[PDB]
Design a protein around this ligand. Structure first.
Ligand SMILES: NC(=O)c1ccc[n+]([C@@H]2O[C@H](COP(=O)([O-])OP(=O)(O)OC[C@H]3O[C@@H](n4cnc5c(N)ncnc54)[C@H](O)[C@@H]3O)[C@@H](O)[C@H]2O)c1
Ligand SMILES: Nc1ncnc2c1ncn2[C@@H]1O[C@H](COP(=O)(O)OP(=O)(O)OP(=O)(O)O)[C@@H](O)[C@H]1O
Ligand SMILES: C/C1=C/C(=O)O[C@@H]2C[C@@H](CC[C@H](C)/C=C/C=C/CC1)O[C@@](O)([C@@H]1CSC(=O)N1)C2
Ligand SMILES: [Ca+2]
Lengths: 413, 358
């Protein structure tokens, strides 16, 4: 071994384990009793603690605040985010292909080979997509090899950047590594490899960071006010008139005009003027970072109604049919569309079942409207008319007894 | 020297004199479309004109039309000169700052009032029953709010708003009566159905039970005589209509119902005051007038709250005018007189004086 660790231990399992063991010993010096307690509980109940860490943000603020699971979540997250790596490191872990919206077996566990058909199917499915990752996850510093456990045919080989939080620790005989996923994954390349007489797909992956405030609406609002106090003074009086008209409830007429293709079917020069100014207003201060926003969609955006049998997502077949129709598809909104920096549920859309979780690239047209006094309570970001969103992945979760859907999507224009 | 109280709502304006027990004038918040047409005289025509509501979901959205409403209020309904009377206006909870500034500018620059003030409607309704602490359910023609108030202060971060109120209930009743085999579709028929709603609807204590009863019994049926003498029957529509408040999915909305917004509002308040709120749930506004609504709210909040919680719903017979009555009492108080914005203060400070004083 060298005096300095490599960025990737590769198949050097013996040096990876020894290095991470030293690292576990060193970080033990920096964890307080509450953090050590958090780690111990995690060892004893990892699956449920990880599950909670993935969906805790989607409930009412007061439901989140009252959940006793918050203590474990916050304390374990503190433990992790505190040991930041000072240069990149590559990690290894297995995923279900379903995680990247490949809702079939790549091969069965008793098959040893992977067909060219399946390889190409997978490639087309996970090509050109950012996949949002959340929650606690155990990873390995070395590539699984002969006599390592290999639960699926899909091995992720992930490059983590400098300042990534990672918690090395020991669980009885084993040296482990905990991270909290808080980024999107891009699959740069896939390759078929062989480990111990079986074919696996190895996915060469990297991350894209975005601001994701989740349930921390106060922080998101601070960020929004910080970046959009200016904006409201930068508008021509025409633009300011036209955006308050929109916000003050003009949106319904303006958006119906757009959705009905009025500009072409039945031009109305006044409305076209309003559409134009609102668009120019959204280009005035483009979204200053990569940013995750959330929208609770009405079923009509996905061709359903309240009484559609297909909107009953408590039945798995309806989830499958939804995925078959929408997952991997690109959708377009002729209307201007509102989103929030917050993921929390709210009274006004408490029962909506379809949540869009949207990655907005830096410099996209958009505005934090809750910098403009009068309507702060929504923590709103308005997106430009004609936006296109690629749906990368559909997840589901329980809100009480009601199954709801999370649509991992990316703004692509 | 007598102050005016003008409670301007989405559907109705309630206006009168401070010190009176009831508003002198109650008239529709409509303009027919300088010059102008207002109230039941905005029914000069529903023809060369159509009716326009300047207050939408409790917020003023057209200032020219609202000036006409206020003109009609002073000169036609109350028969007073605005220059001779301090005027108390009401506003919705969370009324935007620019909105209350514009209200202030219009009162002083257009109407030349000697003094004015803008008070939050829900705070006035709480005050009408002699309370300064409680949570108000204020439900009118256009909007419903839950407003928690502690020692005279509304708590803005815990205010809930639903754009579901009396007009939506009327429109839903038109639909389900039409599905029964009748036909209620026109603007005049909407008024008739509003009357049916106000006379015959009620909130069931157990909705699914009530639906089973009506299904296998004629005992929930009521009759109603139309203006031309046709007598119609109404059955489960009686309680399906206001059920919408608790189940907004009935009209296609995926918001929380009024029991859940009440609970959400309480849960947003400091834990130390929640018991005071549970013990002082007050109802205000025309859409809280349904028989059975206080009992149903009791039952729904009981199911949400801890089993040890003491819950009291207060629904005064006068609730329909609770906001106005609260304004009449407030404007009459000796300790309120220092709170009026005078024309002199407006001249010194401009419209933003309203934030300093109201
Ligand atoms: N929905 C959210 O998560 C969210 C987030 C932030 C702010 N808001 C605020 O809420 C108010 C708007 O409410 P909203 O966004 O629920 O209503 P909306 O105006 O986006 O939608 C109204 C109705 O039209 C449907 N719809 C919209 N676009 C459509 C399309 N392209 N095709 C088919 N159907 C379509 C919706 O499903 C809904 O039934 C605004 O004040 C907005 O600022 C909402
Ligand atoms: N006895 C009753 N039962 C049911 N509904 C009623 C009754 N009386 C009045 N209403 C309804 O209450 C509404 C009017 O109440 P109110 O004057 O409090 O509302 P508003 O102030 O005009 O509107 P908002 O407060 O929403 O801006 C109308 O929809 C009316 O049909
Ligand atoms: C006794 C009365 C009560 C009332 O509340 O009217 C208000 C005001 C009214 C204005 C429109 C009509 C044509 C002109 C009406 C003069 C009305 C006084 C009517 O529009 C409502 O009816 C709406 C429509 S239907 C409903 O549920 N709300 C509420
Ligand atoms: Ca009112």
């Amino acid at each position: 071994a060298f005096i300095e660790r490599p960025e990737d231990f590769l198949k050097d399992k013996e040096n990876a384990i020894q290095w991470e063991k030293k690292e576990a010993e060193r970080v033990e010096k920096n964890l307080d009793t509450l953090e050590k307690e958090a780690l111990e509980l995690y060892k004893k109940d990892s699956e449920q603690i990880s599950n909670y860490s993935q969906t805790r943000q989607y409930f009412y603020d007061y439901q989140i605040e009252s959940n006793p699971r918050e203590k474990e979540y916050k304390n374990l997250r503190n433990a992790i985010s505190k040991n930041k790596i000072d240069k990149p490191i590559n990690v290894y872990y297995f995923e279900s292909p379903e995680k990247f919206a490949f809702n079939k077996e790549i091969r069965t566990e008793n098959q040893n080979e992977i067909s060219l058909e399946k390889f190409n199917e997978l490639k087309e499915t996970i090509q050109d997509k950012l996949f949002k990752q959340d929650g606690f996850k155990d990873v390995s510093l070395y590539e699984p090899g002969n006599g390592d456990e290999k639960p699926t045919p899909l091995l992720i080989h992930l490059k983590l950047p400098k300042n990534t939080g990672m918690l090395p620790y020991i669980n009885s005989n084993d040296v482990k590594t905990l991270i909290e996923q808080d980024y999107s994954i891009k699959i740069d390349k896939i390759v078929r490899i062989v480990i111990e007489g079986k074919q696996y797909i190895k996915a060469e992956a990297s991350i894209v960071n975005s601001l994701d405030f989740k349930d921390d609406v106060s922080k998101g609002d601070l960020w929004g006010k910080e970046n959009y106090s200016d904006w409201s003074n930068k508008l021509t009086p025409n633009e300011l008139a036209d955006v308050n008209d929109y916000m003050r409830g003009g949106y319904t007429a303006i958006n119906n005009y757009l959705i009905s293709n009025g500009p072409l079917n039945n031009p109305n020069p006044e409305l076209d003027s309003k559409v134009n100014n609102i668009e120019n207003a959204l280009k005035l201060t483009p979204i200053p970072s990569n940013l995750i926003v959330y929208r609770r969609s009405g079923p009509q955006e996905f061709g359903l109604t309240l009484t559609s049998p297909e909107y009953d997502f408590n039945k798995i077949e309806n989830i499958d049919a939804f995925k078959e129709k929408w997952e991997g598809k690109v959708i377009t909104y002729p209307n201007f569309i509102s989103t929030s920096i917050g993921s929390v549920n709210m009274s006004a859309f408490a029962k909506r079942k379809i949540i869009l979780r949207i990655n907005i690239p830096k410099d996209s047209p958009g505005a934090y409207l809750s910098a403009i006094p009068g309507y702060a309570g929504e923590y709103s970001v308005l997106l430009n008319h004609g936006s296109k969103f690629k749906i990368n992945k559909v997840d589901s979760y329980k809100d009480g007894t009601v199954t709801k859907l999370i649509l991992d999507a990316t703004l692509i224009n | 020297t007598t102050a005016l109280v003008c409670d301007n709502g989405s559907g109705l304006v309630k206006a009168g004199f401070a010190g009176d027990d009831a508003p002198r004038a109650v008239f529709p918040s409509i303009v027919g479309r300088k010059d102008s047409y207002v109230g039941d005289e905005a029914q000069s025509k529903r023809g060369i004109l159509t009716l326009k509501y300047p207050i939408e979901h409790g917020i003023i959205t057209n200032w020219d039309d609202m000036e006409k409403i206020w003109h009609h209020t002073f000169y036609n309904e109350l028969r007073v000169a605005p220059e001779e009377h301090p005027t108390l206006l009401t506003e919705a909870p969370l009324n935007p700052k620019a909105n209350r500034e514009k209200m202030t500018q219009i009162m002083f620059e257009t109407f030349n009032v000697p003094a004015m003030y803008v008070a939050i409607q829900a705070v006035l309704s709480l005050y009408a029953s002699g309370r300064t602490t409680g949570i108000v359910l204020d439900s009118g023609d256009g909007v419903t709010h839950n407003v928690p108030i502690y020692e005279g202060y509304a708590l803005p971060h815990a205010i809930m708003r639903l754009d579901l109120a009396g007009r939506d209930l009327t429109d839903y009743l038109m639909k389900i009566l039409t599905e029964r085999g009748y036909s209620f579709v026109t603007t005049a028929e909407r008024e008739i159905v509003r009357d049916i709603k106000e006379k015959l609807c009620y909130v069931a204590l157990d909705f699914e039970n009530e639906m089973a009863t009506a299904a296998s019994s004629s005992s929930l049926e009521k009759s109603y005589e139309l203006p031309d003498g046709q007598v119609i029957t109404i059955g489960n529509e009686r309680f399906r209509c206001p059920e919408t408040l608790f189940q907004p999915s009935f009209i296609g909305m995926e918001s929380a119902g009024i029991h859940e917004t009440t609970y959400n509002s309480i849960m947003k308040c400091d834990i130390d005051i929640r018991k005071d709120l549970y013990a002082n749930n007050v109802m205000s506004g025309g859409t809280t007038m349904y028989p059975g609504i206080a009992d149903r709210m009791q039952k729904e909040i009981t199911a949400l709250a801890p089993s040890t919680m003491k819950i009291k719903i207060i629904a005064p017979p006068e609730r329909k005018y609770s906001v106005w009555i609260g304004g009449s009492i407030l404007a009459s108080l000796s300790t309120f007189q220092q709170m009026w914005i005078t024309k002199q203060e407006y001249d010194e400070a401009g419209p933003s004086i309203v934030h300093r004083k109201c």
